[PDB]
């Protein structure tokens, strides 16, 4: 029974590696200068954004540029999370309405989870590890733009304190997607069956990979509610932007995800 749970873990880790180009292993390698990849460009003020901008591939106010660059990343992250979800056994056999609902509610929680992999207390990697934008600079963006990233840094510093690795994260984000309490699910039961198997694999995974971290499984499940508060607050700030800023349409896919979200 332990071998089947470990095969599930290996399957999930392999799909994670195929779906997400920048893993936590490589992000840790950037943040402690251990890679052979060149160092990120450090964006710390208005002038260094323009100085490093040419390494950013994007086709089409500093804060408006940060907003656009972010949106571009979010759309690619949704696509990566959808590929990963597609590799979760049982997921693509569920009623497409439920597949859609689970993506709709889980994608941003996974985005914030994996974003934590790219953060330390002083900033975040951008553009697949090619740049590094400092926390102080994001916090110094004109309101309300300066308020978006700061709660994610708070969460990341606590989440990275759990010292999870890519192999843990693959199962945890699978657990997240297969959440039976998503509003609007038609058949909760097959979902919950898949999630209980994912949960068993996650519990075995954390017990083997992090002995001497008592109750790590429970701490990690508590972070799911942290993620939910983060999503709620992000939505409220998006509505400040949509109500106050001029021409800030979201990409149609992000609009599709947030329409009638909660």
């Amino acid at each position: 029974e332990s071998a089947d749970l470990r095969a599930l873990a290996k399957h999930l880790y392999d799909s994670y590696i195929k779906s997400f180009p920048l893993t936590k292993a490589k992000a840790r390698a950037i943040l402690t200068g251990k890679t052979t990849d060149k160092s990120p460009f450090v964006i710390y003020d208005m002038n260094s954004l323009m100085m490093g901008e040419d390494k950013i591939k994007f086709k089409h106010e500093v804060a408006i540029r940060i907003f656009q660059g972010c949106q571009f990343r979010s759309v690619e992250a949704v696509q990566e999370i959808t590929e990963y979800a597609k590799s979760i056994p049982g997921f693509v056999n569920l009623d497409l309405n439920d597949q859609v609902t689970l993506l709709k509610y889980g994608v941003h929680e996974i985005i914030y989870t994996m974003l934590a992999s790219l953060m330390n207390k002083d900033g975040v990697l951008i553009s697949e590890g090619q740049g590094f934008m400092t926390r102080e600079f994001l916090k110094s963006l004109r309101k309300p733009f300066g308020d978006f990233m700061e709660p994610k840094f708070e969460f990341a510093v606590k989440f990275n304190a759990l010292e999870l690795d890519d192999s843990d994260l693959a199962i945890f984000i699978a657990v997240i997607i297969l959440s039976g309490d998503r509003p609007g699910l038609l058949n909760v039961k097959p979902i919950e069956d898949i999630q209980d198997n994912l949960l068993q694999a996650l519990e075995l995974q954390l017990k083997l990979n992090h002995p001497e971290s008592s109750q790590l499984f429970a701490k990690l499940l508590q972070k799911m509610t942290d993620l939910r508060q983060i999503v709620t607050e992000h939505v409220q700030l998006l509505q400040v932007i949509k109500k106050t800023e001029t021409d800030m349409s979201l990409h149609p896919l992000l609009q599709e995800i947030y329409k009638d979200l909660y």
């Binding site: 949704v78 696509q79 959808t82 590929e83 979800a85 597609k86 693509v92 497409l96 309405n97 439920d98 597949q99 859609v100 609902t101 993506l103 709709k104 609007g184 149609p252 896919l253 599709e256 995800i257 329409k259 009638d260």
Partner: peptide
């Protein structure tokens, strides 16, 4: 005809096939 799949055309498109 009207359900969540229809209200999320782009998510649906991403989810199909592979």
């Amino acid at each position: 005809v009207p359900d969540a799949a229809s209200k999320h055309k782009q998510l649906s498109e991403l989810l199909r096939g592979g």
